[PDB]
Design a protein around this ligand. Structure first.
Ligand SMILES: O=P(O)(O)OP(=O)(O)OP(=O)(O)OC[C@H]1O[C@@H](n2cnc3c(O)ncnc32)[C@H](O)[C@@H]1O
Ligand SMILES: O=P(O)(O)OP(=O)(O)OP(=O)(O)OC[C@H]1O[C@@H](n2cnc3c(O)ncnc32)[C@H](O)[C@@H]1O
Ligand SMILES: [Mg+2]
Ligand SMILES: [Mg+2]
Lengths: 184, 194
């Protein structure tokens, strides 16, 4: 915790859009300095905690310096929290349009979006979560499942929202707030 | 090649799934030139393609057991969903049950599906390669029929048959299953020899 002050932290992720968000959802005065190195890291099957812990332990082996990773899950309550940690693949095969069709046989259109950051130099996690409902796609297409996730309290999806608004209310925000709050 | 090295020897089928073991032992009769010893370890599986998952699972089994080793992974793949849930079928069965796995295709017209079963065999030496053996049955996902004995069987009706895996007597399932097709490749491999 205190050890990482003013240090360099290699943030490892291939995803340009999430990195771009993570830079923006903080700034001066985040104590450390981040450095993006794109590496396509291989994730395990199971629970987001276990996955994130292991994903981080994998990054440690390859970078060896101080390191940070993250995982995002889109979890449908109708489907016991699935696709959850496998969302990436469902998005690859179905796209947002299809993700809505996936719940066509269920009344419960509700869901939640989970974001789990993992840190190393004993691994520590920082979790953020937003509840909502899965709808027919509305808005821009340039970032994953945003078009079909309508968060609770709002009449527009994450894709429709101006990035500024999303960055204030999102699952990522919730997690990043833990990360920042941990230092000071 | 490794066929020669493993013939007559002990191979450890490392799996946590007993029903799956029960079917392997009833498919391979007294007709197998090697001896199977089940050892229950529940192994972690990577995300990705079926082959690379199988390979890696084996290599993990190799680390924990040290002798010759056999592992396997089963997939249930819906064509409407581009081969999903596929290798992550466990977790969908676990949450949705067969009734739910049907409902999953409710808004999709295409009910066609296939089950893929991959076996992965290693000698024990981690440096030389893992040999793979697939089999795949085709069918469609239907409203659950039969009896909840084994996993997703009630909702899978194979092509050319009018009843589901669960409705079939276990003897008929073992004559036509994805796992039978894969163990055929394993028995093809051995029995190229004498
Ligand atoms: O580079 P890494 O860090 O490994 O990230 P990834 O691309 O593999 O992505 P994940 O493992 O976190 O899986 C989440 C999927 O959901 C998408 N995603 C993640 N966060 C999102 C957000 O806030 N809004 C929309 N889509 C998001 C992203 O495109 C991925 O396909
Ligand atoms: O991998 P191991 O350690 O052997 O045990 P497992 O239960 O994790 O096995 P899988 O990875 O193949 O998971 C596939 C899921 O589908 C089920 N399954 C596997 N073969 C099946 C079959 O032939 N008929 C019905 N269900 C099956 C099984 O119970 C799992 O829930
Ligand atoms: Mg990822
Ligand atoms: Mg398994």
């Amino acid at each position: 915790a205190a050890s990482l002050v003013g240090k360099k932290i290699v943030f490892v992720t291939g995803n340009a859009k999430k990195l771009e968000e993570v830079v923006q959802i903080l700034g001066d005065k985040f104590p450390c300095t981040l450095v993006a190195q794109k590496i396509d890291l291989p994730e395990y099957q199971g629970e987001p905690d276990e996955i994130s812990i292991q994903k981080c332990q994998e990054a440690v082996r390859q970078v060896q310096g101080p390191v940070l990773v993250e995982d995002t899950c889109l979890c449908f309550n109708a489907l016991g929290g699935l696709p959850g940690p496998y969302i990436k693949w469902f998005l690859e095969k179905l796209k947002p349009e299809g993700l809505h069709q996936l719940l066509a046989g269920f009344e419960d259109k509700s869901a939640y979006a989970l974001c789990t950051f993992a840190l190393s130099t004993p691994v520590r996690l920082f979790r953020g979560r937003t509840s909502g409902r899965i709808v027919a796609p509305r808005g821009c297409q340039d970032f994953g499942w945003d078009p079909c996730f309508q968060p609770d309290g709002y009449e527009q999806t994450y894709a429709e929202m101006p990035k500024a608004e999303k960055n204030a209310v999102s699952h990522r925000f919730r997690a990043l707030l833990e990360l920042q709050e941990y230092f000071g």
